[PDB]
Amino acid sequence: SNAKDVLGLTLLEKTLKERLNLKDAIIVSGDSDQSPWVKKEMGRAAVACMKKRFSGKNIVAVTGGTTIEAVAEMMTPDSKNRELLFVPARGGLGEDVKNQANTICAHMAEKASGTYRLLFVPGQLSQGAYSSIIEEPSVKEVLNTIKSASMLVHGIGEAKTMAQRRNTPLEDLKKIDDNDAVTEAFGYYFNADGEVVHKVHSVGMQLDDIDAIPDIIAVAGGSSKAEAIEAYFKKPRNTVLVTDEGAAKKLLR
Amino acid sequence: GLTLLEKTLKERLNLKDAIIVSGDSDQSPWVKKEMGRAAVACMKKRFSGKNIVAVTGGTTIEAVAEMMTPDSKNRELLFVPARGGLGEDVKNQANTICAHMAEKASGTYRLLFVPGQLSQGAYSSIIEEPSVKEVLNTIKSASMLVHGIGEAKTMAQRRNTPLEDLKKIDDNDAVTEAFGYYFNADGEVVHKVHSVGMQLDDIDAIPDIIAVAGGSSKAEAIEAYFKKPRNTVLVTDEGAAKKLLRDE
Ligand SMILES: O=P(O)(O)OC[C@H]1O[C@](O)(CO)[C@@H](O)[C@@H]1O
Ligand SMILES: O=P(O)(O)OC[C@H]1O[C@](O)(CO)[C@@H](O)[C@@H]1O
């Protein structure tokens, strides 16, 4: 791309991909921590990435957070009219409703002119209540759909920021801090070496399940996220990262 | 102050206040948007420093949401649905209207996530859980309610009312509906949709209630709902008001 070439993004993408061993790196100009439109541009870039990767039939698992909400906001109908079903990856993870995967999922599906199926399993159910709810045919059906996701679109967060944003019990805050968590993705907190140090108790997709998902797109940027993004990608994730100059330049510095 | 039509409607229906926009929303669809605009202005006049606003679904309150704008006074705004599922399709559900209105207001919101395809047993489990109780408690503390009014038969059909309940609604001569309750011509409850959240007895404690409903087809339904004292502000149109008052 001549735009990417003149802006130095082509080189920055190659350098970032090599540094993090990514399947691919897509970087938009600017720093989303400073300039609001940059998050929207990450959203647009992620949508392009998704459309390039869709097949004839698609089950797209999505996480919540403001970044995947920006992907949803930038989503448009498929000109090839391929079959699109959107589901949340997990149960919502203690996010307020605006930031929950169900909310992002519904928004994305409407914008894509696709269909969606939501997962309603509250995070603080008693053992007994949980046992009954997961046997419910409607819950089983959504969980089974998630098990066959062909695509995952997910955010990445700094550990402390995420622990604070969600309704994280004191007991869990202590564990997150004691084990030096630096980054978070889809209900897992990781340390600087990309090892899992704390897991949010949820339903749906688990970390081991991503290996079976052919197309995974992480969308996260802003200089504040540089260490979080680096830590997450310490492990093989077979993932395309959509990010911005803010995060990428800080990471590479 | 009030026009003679507004003054007459306020007296006739024992309203806290009447706001009547021009035209008949059953003939001129955009008039629903003008009811929405007037309702938003009314809400803004009644806000305190901190607010918990319970809202119903339906196209009229969706129009309120569409016309909502942020508060120039920057008052604290938390929106919630009044009740759980009432059997509306997604576009007409209180949860949908609630999220839309909150976004337009730059406020915050909480949703109720109840019945759906779930068993009674699984349903009861959900309503016991901490976050769900929190929303129910928030609704219980509402400082404002913004609700629609519909014709009973129309509303029963739009929702997916079981045949046995359709028969009961008909047999008891329901004529009007609001927030999941069906009322006869004397404004007495004759059938209720089962749903968590706000109950009819709870409206008395809510300081500001704004009903938004118009169109000549709703004149009978509006009159009947207000046959009992509701201490409510009605935002309506000339279509409804003139027909109700026999002034056209
Ligand atoms: O895009 P944001 O707003 O930074 O949030 C990202 C976070 O949201 C989630 O995707 C959902 O909780 C987290 O896994 C991730 O840490
Ligand atoms: O504004 P509409 O579309 O006529 O619907 C009014 C109806 O919508 C609801 O508020 C929601 O179901 C009902 O209580 C009310 O009767």
Question: Residue positions of A in the annotated binding site for beta-D-fructose 1,6-bisphosphate?
Answer: 64-67, 90, 100, 165-166, 184, 225
Identify all chain B residues contacting A122, using CB atoms and an 8 Å cutoff. 113, 126, 129-132
Identify all chain A residues contacting B121, using CB atoms and an 8 Å cutoff. 132
The CA distance from A64 to A214, in Å, is 20
The CA distance from A8 to A98, in Å, is 36
The CA distance from B53 to A7, in Å, is 48
User: β-strands B144-147, B208-212: how paired?
Assistant: parallel
Of A97, A123, A129, the CB nearest to B125: A129
Name the CATH topology of B1-248.
Answer: Rossmann fold (3.40.50)
Give, rounded to a whole angstrom, the gap between the first and last alpha carbons of chain A: 24
DSSP B197: B
DSSP string covering B61-81: HHHHHHH----TT--EEEEEE
Of A96, A124, A133, the CB nearest to B122: A133
Query: How many Å lie between the centroid of ligand 1 and the Cα of residue B51?
Result: 28
In contact, A87 and A106? CB cutoff 8 Å = no
In contact, B40 and B64? CB cutoff 8 Å = yes
Question: Which amino acid is present at A184?
Answer: E
Question: Which amino acid is present at A219?
Answer: V
- What b/e sequence results for A71-87 when a residue is b if at least 16 CB atoms lie within 10 Å of its CB, and e otherwise? bbbbbeebeeeeebbbb
Contact (CB<8Å) B119/A125: no
Angle between helices B59-67 and B94-105 (to 10 degrees): 10
In contact, B66 and B29? CB cutoff 8 Å = no
Tokens of A176: 């997150």
Look-up: residue for tokens 């011509």? B185
Question: Cβ(A94) to ligand 1 under 6 A?
Answer: no
Question: Cβ(B84) to ligand 2 under 6 A?
Answer: no
Look-up: residue for tokens 């305190």? B48
Q: In whole angstroms, how far apart are CA A170 and each of A18, A113, A163, A176?
A: 39, 41, 10, 10
Provide the resolution (angstroms). 1.9
Give SS3 for B234.
strand
Give the determination technique. X-ray
Pocket of ligand 2, candidates B66, B98, B177: which has the most ligand atoms within 8 Å of its Cβ, to mutate?
Answer: B177
Look-up: residue for tokens 């403001």? A66
The CA distance from B94 to B111, in Å, is 9
Look-up: residue for tokens 């959240």? B197
Tokens of B121: 């047993």
The CA distance from B125 to B118, in Å, is 10
Question: Which amino acid is present at B211?
Answer: A
Residue B131, chain A, CB below 8 Å: the answer is yes
**Residue of chain A with shortest Cα separation from B122:** A133
- Give the count of beta carbons closer than 10 Å to the beta carbon of residue B72: 7
Angle between helices A245-252 and A9-20 (to 10 degrees): 60
Question: Cβ(B178) to ligand 2 under 6 A?
Answer: yes
What distance lies between CA B194 and its chain's CA centroid?
Answer: 16
Helix (H) or strand (E) holding B32: helix B31-46
Residue B126, chain A, CB below 8 Å: the answer is yes
Distance from CA of A103 to the nearest CA of B (A): 10
Tokens of B147: 């609700």
Identify all chain B residues contacting A103, using CB atoms and an 8 Å cutoff. 99
Query: How many Å lie between the centroid of ligand 1 and the Cα of residue A164?
Result: 12
Bridge partner list, A157: A184
- Give the count of beta carbons closer than 10 Å to the beta carbon of residue B14: 13
Contact (CB<8Å) A98/B111: no
Query: What does residue B243 show for φ and ψ, rounded to 5 degrees?
Result: -70, -45
Look-up: residue for tokens 């992480």? A218
Tell me, letter by letter, the H, E, C secondary structure of chain A. Answer: CHHHHHHCHHHHHHHHHHHHCCCEEEEECCCCCCCCHHHHHHHHHHHHHHHHHCCCEEEEEECCCHHHHHHHHHCCCCCCCCEEEEEECECCCCCCHHHCHHHHHHHHHHHHCCEECCCCCCCCCCHHHHHHHCCCHHHHHHHHHHHCCCEEEECCEEHHHHHHHCCCCHHHHHHHHHCCCCEEECCEEECCCCCEEEECCCCECCHHHHHHCCEEEEECCCHHHHHHHHHHCCCCCCEEEEEEHHHHHHHHC
Query: Alpha helix locations (H) across B58-215?
Result: 59-67, 94-105, 120-128, 130-140, 152-158, 163-171
The CA distance from A83 to A57, in Å, is 5
Indicate the CATH number for domain A1-253. Answer: 3.40.50.1360
The CA distance from B34 to B235, in Å, is 10
